Amino acid sequence: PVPTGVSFDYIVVGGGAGGIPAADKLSEAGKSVLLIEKGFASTANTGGTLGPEWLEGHDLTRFDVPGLCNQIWVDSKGIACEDTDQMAGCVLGGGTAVNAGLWFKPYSLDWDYLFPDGWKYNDVQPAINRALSRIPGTDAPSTDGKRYYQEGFEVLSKGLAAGGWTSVTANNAPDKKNRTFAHAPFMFAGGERNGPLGTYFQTAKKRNNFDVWLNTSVKRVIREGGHITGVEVEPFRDGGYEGIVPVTKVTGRVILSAGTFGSAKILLRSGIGPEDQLEVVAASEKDGPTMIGNSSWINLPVGYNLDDHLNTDTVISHPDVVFYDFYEAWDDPIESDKNSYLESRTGILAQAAPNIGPMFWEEIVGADGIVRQLQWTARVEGSLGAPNGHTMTMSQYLGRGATSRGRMTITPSLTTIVSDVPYLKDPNDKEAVIQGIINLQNALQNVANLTWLFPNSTITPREYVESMVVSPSNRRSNHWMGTNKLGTDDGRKGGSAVVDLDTRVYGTDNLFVIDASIFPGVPTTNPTSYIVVAAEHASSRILALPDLEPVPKYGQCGGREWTGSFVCADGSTCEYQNEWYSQCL
Numbered sequence: 001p002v003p004t005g006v007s008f009d010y011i012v013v014g015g016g017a018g019g020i021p022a023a024d025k026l027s028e029a030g031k032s033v034l035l036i037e038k039g040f041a042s043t044a045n046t047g048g049t050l051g052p053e054w055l056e057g058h059d060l061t062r063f064d065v066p067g068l069c070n071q072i073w074v075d076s077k078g079i080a081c082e083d084t085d086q087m088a089g090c091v092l093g094g095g096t097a098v099n100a101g102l103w104f105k106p107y108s109l110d111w112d113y114l115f116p117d118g119w120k121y122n123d124v125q126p127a128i129n130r131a132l133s134r135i136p137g138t139d140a141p142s143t144d145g146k147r148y149y150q151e152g153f154e155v156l157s158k159g160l161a162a163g164g165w166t167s168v169t170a171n172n173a174p175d176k177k178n179r180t181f182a183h184a185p186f187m188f189a190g191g192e193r194n195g196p197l198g199t200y201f202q203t204a205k206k207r208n209n210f211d212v213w214l215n216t217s218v219k220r221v222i223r224e225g226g227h228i229t230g231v232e233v234e235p236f237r238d239g240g241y242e243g244i245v246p247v248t249k250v251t252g253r254v255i256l257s258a259g260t261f262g263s264a265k266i267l268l269r270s271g272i273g274p275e276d277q278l279e280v281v282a283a284s285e286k287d288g289p290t291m292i293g294n295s296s297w298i299n300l301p302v303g304y305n306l307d308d309h310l311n312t313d314t315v316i317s318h319p320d321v322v323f324y325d326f327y328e329a330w331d332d333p334i335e336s337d338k339n340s341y342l343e344s345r346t347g348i349l350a351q352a353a354p355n356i357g358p359m360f361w362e363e364i365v366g367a368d369g370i371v372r373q374l375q376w377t378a379r380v381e382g383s384l385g386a387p388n389g390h391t392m393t394m395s396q397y398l399g400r401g402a403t404s405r406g407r408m409t410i411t412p413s414l415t416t417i418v419s420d421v422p423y424l425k426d427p428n429d430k431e432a433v434i435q436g437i438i439n440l441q442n443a444l445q446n447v448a449n450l451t452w453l454f455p456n457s458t459i460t461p462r463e464y465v466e467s468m469v470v471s472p473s474n475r476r477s478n479h480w481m482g483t484n485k486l487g488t489d490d491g492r493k494g495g496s497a498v499v500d501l502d503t504r505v506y507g508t509d510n511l512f513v514i515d516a517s518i519f520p521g522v523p524t525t526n527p528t529s530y531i532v533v534a535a536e537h538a539s540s541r542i543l544a545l546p547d548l549e550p551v552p553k554y555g556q557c558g559g560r561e562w563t564g565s566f567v568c569a570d571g572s573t574c575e576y577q578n579e580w581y582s583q584c585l
């Protein structure tokens with residue numbers, strides 16, 4: 001049901017980590033902004049009604065309560081995305097609606113190392129200060145200020161300190177990421193999930209110039225040559241819109257926030273991507289008939305540069321470790337905790353599941369003289385089939401500096417798949433992983449009664465690693481990034497960049513990408529704060545661009561190398577001549 005009479009200055013596709021802050025910042029500037037979201041209302045502050053029965057009538061949903069964080073693992077359906085082969089949030093708030101909520105003041109090195117000039121640390125520091133003003137951490141999300149079931153934590157944190165590692169409050173010392181441990185920071189506020197759903201979205205829905213369309217999927221963008229006139233929508237659930245939504249004439253811009261796999265899909269379907277992938281959509285049953293003609297295709301490396309943290313699990317067990325079963329907190333919650341979540345917002349349930357114990361980091365100089373960044377996350381839970389009771393799992397992330405990369409491609413079904421596994425292609429990446437375990441072991445060699453299950457004392461760290469299967473299934477961190485890479489090297493000429501420094505899509509005048517897909521690689525940390533920061537930074541850059549000026553007739557409106565305006569002044573049209581030229585006539 002698309003209304004025959006309306007248009008927007010900005011259309012933002014997808015309501016995730018990138019999209020919600022983008023839509024907020026653009027509407028704050030008084031532009032007409034429409035947020036189009038696949039999924040439904042999630043958290044209570046967005047009008048989400050969904051959740052377990054012990055939550056009735058107290059104005060909370062399954063997405064408000066950090067202790068219910070891990071339900072997505074046993075019950076995801078109608079929530080997780082069905083058009084990808086990996087795990088992603090398809091409700092409002094995207095990933096930030098379903099994840100553990102870990103939230104980090106970024107590490108200045110990450111921006112200096114991963115991004116070209118204009119995105120380095122001195123460039124994005126204002127966006128960092130904005131994002132973290134709206135969402136300061138807490139490493140003690142329970143509103144009374146003290147942390148619960150910390151016995152596991154204290155075992156490890158005293159273990160590490162003894163091993164020569166330094167305690168920090170992570171977000172007070174964002175830049176100290178070598179040989180460091182901290183209480184885990186979260187985006188929570190008032191003991192409720194909070195995040196961008198809690199902050200950016202709330203200021204935006206107070207605005208007249210802001211609109212949200214839920215239960216609505218964007219199929220592709222509607223473009224004449226290099227200029228995007230609108231987006232085409234089919235309902236994902238009844239009550240969603242069918243149609244084609246226009247953007248303000250000439251001026252209008254579209255922002256793709258649909259995610260690392262989401263935005264990539266929309267691009268391919270819009271005739272933007274690699275020749276082979278574009279060819280798959282052309283032969284597709286769903287879009288084949290109505291897809292844009294191949295003369296208007298743009299070749300860019302959409303789907304390449306697929307990146308993720310390489311995850312390696314490890315397990316220990318110790319006597320004073322205390323397990324808590326968060327899965328059992330969905331159905332039959334321990335009643336004092338339920339009582340003491342529902343009234344002052346405290347107790348174990350105001351912490352994310354499972355209990356997420358010490359965060360610790362170190363940086364390893366490799367034989368190639370590349371610095372590789374590690375992050376460990378400890379939790380109280382078994383992992384590798386080790387039992388749940390006294391165990392703690394310590395998961396090692398291989399982050400910034402790792403050189404390997406995979407690929408995302410599309411099926412005839414128009415669902416996305418990871419067809420090149422990104423992990424451990426460079427052996428020096430493996431070397432850092434192994435050395436990190438060795439290092440972890442000697443800091444914990446002095447702890448009384450600590451038992452090493454994974455690896456057990458009968459296997460060497462090296463053997464332990466080489467035996468493992470390298471696949472998303474066992475090794476994914478769910479931190480997928482990079483399919484639409486930001487960079488100065490235009491993809492149409494063979495470069496690696498899908499979008500430019502303004503996040504503008506090469507080959508287009510008005511189309512932009514803000515989400516995890518633009519990152520040249522993964523950062524030190526869980527990315528959500530990074531993606532929010534990037535939303536802050538990109539929206540201000542985009543808002544500093546002057547209004548698009550149309551092309552006078554007889555002028556150039558397009559071509560394979562064209563960087564300029566693709567739209568024609570009133571009284572002439574843009575028509576193709578050859579792949580290097582298009583004129584107004």
Ligand SMILES: Cc1cc2nc3c(=O)[nH]c(=O)nc-3n(C[C@H](O)[C@H](O)[C@H](O)COP(=O)(O)OP(=O)(O)OC[C@H]3O[C@@H](n4cnc5c(N)ncnc54)[C@H](O)[C@@H]3O)c2cc1C
Pocket residue numbers: 013014015016017018019036037038039072087088089090091092093094095096098099100101102103216217218219257258259260262263266478479480514515516517525526527528529531
């Ligand atoms: C379960 C899990 C655990 C994780 N743990 C953490 C954590 O504790 N901390 C951390 O920093 N991050 C965590 N992450 C990483 C994180 O969730 C993502 O990195 C981040 O949310 C990605 O932001 P995004 O904007 O690129 O994607 P998304 O948040 O996934 O945004 C996608 C949004 O667009 C919508 N959408 C998709 N396609 C369309 C379409 N065609 N039309 C309209 N709308 C569409 C989706 O419904 C969704 O709302 C984890 C995520 C997973 C899933």
Ligand SMILES: *[C@@H]1O[C@H](CO)[C@@H](O[C@@H]2O[C@H](CO)[C@@H](O)[C@H](O)[C@H]2NC(C)=O)[C@H](O)[C@H]1NC(C)=O
Pocket residue numbers: 040041048049050214215237238239240
């Ligand atoms: C989007 O779809 C959802 C799910 O079907 C709709 O949410 C339901 O709304 C009814 C009444 O409006 C409630 O009784 C249900 O509890 C809701 N279900 C869920 C899962 O939230 C929602 O109304 C739809 N939104 C639009 C704009 O059409």
Ligand SMILES: *[C@@H]1O[C@H](CO)[C@@H](O[C@@H]2O[C@H](CO)[C@@H](O)[C@H](O)[C@H]2NC(C)=O)[C@H](O)[C@H]1NC(C)=O
Pocket residue numbers: 178179363364365371
């Ligand atoms: C992180 O800190 C550790 C120790 O603080 C550094 O370890 C040193 O590594 C070099 C070789 O890379 C050795 O020659 C030194 O003797 C080590 N010192 C200690 C105390 O172990 C490590 O190099 C640091 N990493 C970075 C990237 O700064």
Ligand SMILES: *[C@@H]1O[C@H](CO)[C@@H](O)[C@H](O)[C@H]1NC(C)=O
Pocket residue numbers: 294295
């Ligand atoms: C482009 O489209 C034309 C007509 O639809 C077709 O004949 C031609 O083979 C196509 N070329 C490619 C490379 O897809």
